[PDB]
Design a protein around this ligand. Structure first.
Ligand code: HG
Ligand code: HG
Ligand code: HG
Length: 266
């Protein structure tokens, strides 16, 4: 909206790719976010000028409440630092949520479950980021991921052929995807977008899972199977590389990953 201020940074080189070892744009022209593809100063300026607020949601039930301290402490060091952040922790144990110190412009809401409106999200944040709690941030996760709708490449399948993707393969399921279809295998543990697009996705997923239930079938990878069907039919406007969802104990640290940003806890 507003003009960016004068900024000094390296001139982009038209005849010089940022990365030659990986695909940085999908065939529907959505950027695939890898280290080296973005200038975070330009993006930070663009998003701050819009006074962007990012909501980060996590479900922590039963034993999972134990992961909240590290998750939030590391989010404080690496997630959207400099921007407005609203954490939404859905838990069955409100009194067990750790007292974590937050930087300025950041807040946390605890929502008790068994149960208990979506309209709140529309008025409180601009973007929603949905992740799992048994994780920790190890490096920068910022506005470079923000877009109307994004999915993240599952770390175990980014180099796999589509026939190997663990999509739901039974025609009887609403999440069904035949062997000759599919762009990528997205992990269900890290997706997001504008509030409107995220609610559209979760609403579609919920409806599809109910149809399957009534039909006596459960998709091979549950919610993740449906997320993949949804993103196959509604292409994400950005796709995050595995830098954003990794498991070093299980997969090591490949040369193609210049940074390990959000990882599974051992
Ligand atoms: Hg969410
Ligand atoms: Hg669902
Ligand atoms: Hg979904």
């Amino acid at each position: 909206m507003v003009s960016l201020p004068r900024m000094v940074y390296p001139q982009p080189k038209v005849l010089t790719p940022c990365r030659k070892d990986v695909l940085v744009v999908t065939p529907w022209l959505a950027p695939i976010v890898w280290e080296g593809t973005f200038n975070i100063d330009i993006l930070n300026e663009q998003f701050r000028l819009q006074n962007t607020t990012i909501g980060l949601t996590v479900f922590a039930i039963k034993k999972y409440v134990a992961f909240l301290k590290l998750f939030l402490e590391t989010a404080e060091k690496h997630f959207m630092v400099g921007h407005r952040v609203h954490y939404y922790v859905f838990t069955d144990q409100p009194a067990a949520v750790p007292r974590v110190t937050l930087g300025t412009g950041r807040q946390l809401s605890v929502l008790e479950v068994g149960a208990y409106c979506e309209r709140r999200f529309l008025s409180e944040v601009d973007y929603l980021v949905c992740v799992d709690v048994d994780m920790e941030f190890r490096d920068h996760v910022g506005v470079e991921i923000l877009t109307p709708l994004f999915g993240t490449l599952h770390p175990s399948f980014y180099g796999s052929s589509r026939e190997a993707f663990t999509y739901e393969r039974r025609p009887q399921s609403q999440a069904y995807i035949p062997k000759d279809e599919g762009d990528f295998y997205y992990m269900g543990a890290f997706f997001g977008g504008s509030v409107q697009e995220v609610q559209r996705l979760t609403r579609a997923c919920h409806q599809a899972m109910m149809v399957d239930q009534a039909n006596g079938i459960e998709a091979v990878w549950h919610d993740e199977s449906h997320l993949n069907k949804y993103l196959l039919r509604h292409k994400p406007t950005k796709v995050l590389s595995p830098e954003y969802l990794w498991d070093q104990q299980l997969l090591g640290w490949p040369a193609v990953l210049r940074k390990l940003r959000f990882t599974a806890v051992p």
